Amino acid sequence: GAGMEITSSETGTNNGYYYSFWTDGGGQVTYTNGPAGQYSVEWSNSGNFVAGKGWNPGSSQTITYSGEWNPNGNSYLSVYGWTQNPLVEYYIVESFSTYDPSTGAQELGTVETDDGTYKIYQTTRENAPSIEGTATFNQYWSVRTDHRVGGTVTTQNHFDAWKNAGLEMGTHNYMIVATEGYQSSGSASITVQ
């Protein structure tokens, strides 16, 4: 892993961390594992891609992450992952570029944590890609009102706020600090501590 450039989807472990790189193959996307919890990604006229390091299975650990997120166009930086039974894709959005991803989603409240205010939303993806195949599932969103690149994400506070709103969480699959992009270029270099 450490230092090897990859250009198509893979998951594995690198330097004690789980890592997930997924791309639909649009434009160019290059992912690299670095030392410890560090990853780099560079993209150029991308389709949809998700990249980052973390844990499988994810728990309710308080994550600290640092580094650098330089997108040109649509990109989010998030604590990202999935539960099963029910199937749930979830996002704790630290920053987004040119597109608020909670657009067309329904706001269920706010949660204050990690010196932030985060707005809570749910959508339903219908017949979309998933960790268990083409499926119909809820996505949950916590979106920081004041964007940042680096700090503490107390995921327990986001899960409790979702559960508070009546949002079911199943059994935790992976949870990563993810760089996502769509129809953009950019680079990002992020360390999970």
Let me know: does 66 contact 60? Beta carbons within 8 Å: no
Q: Is 147 assigned to a binding site?
A: yes
Q: What kind of fold does domain 5-192 have according to CATH?
A: Jelly Rolls (2.60.120)
Domain ranges, ordered by start, for the chain? 5-192
Alpha carbon distance, N-terminus to C-terminus of the chain: 18
Tokens representing 117 are: 């205010």
Q: Is 49 assigned to a binding site?
A: no
Q: Mark out the alpha helices in the chain (DSSP H runs).
A: 155-164
Written as one letter, the residue type at 127 is N
Let me know: does 76 contact 149? Beta carbons within 8 Å: no
Whose tokens are 């994810």? That residue is: 58
Q: Is 160 assigned to a binding site?
A: no
Verify whether residue 89 is a known catalytic residue: yes
Q: Reported resolution in A?
A: 2.3
Beta strands in the chain (DSSP E): 5-6, 10-14, 17-23, 28-33, 38-44, 49-55, 62-72, 75-84, 88-96, 106-113, 116-128, 135-144, 151-154, 171-181, 185-192
Catalytic residue among 5, 42, 68, 89: 89
Residues counted in the chain: 193
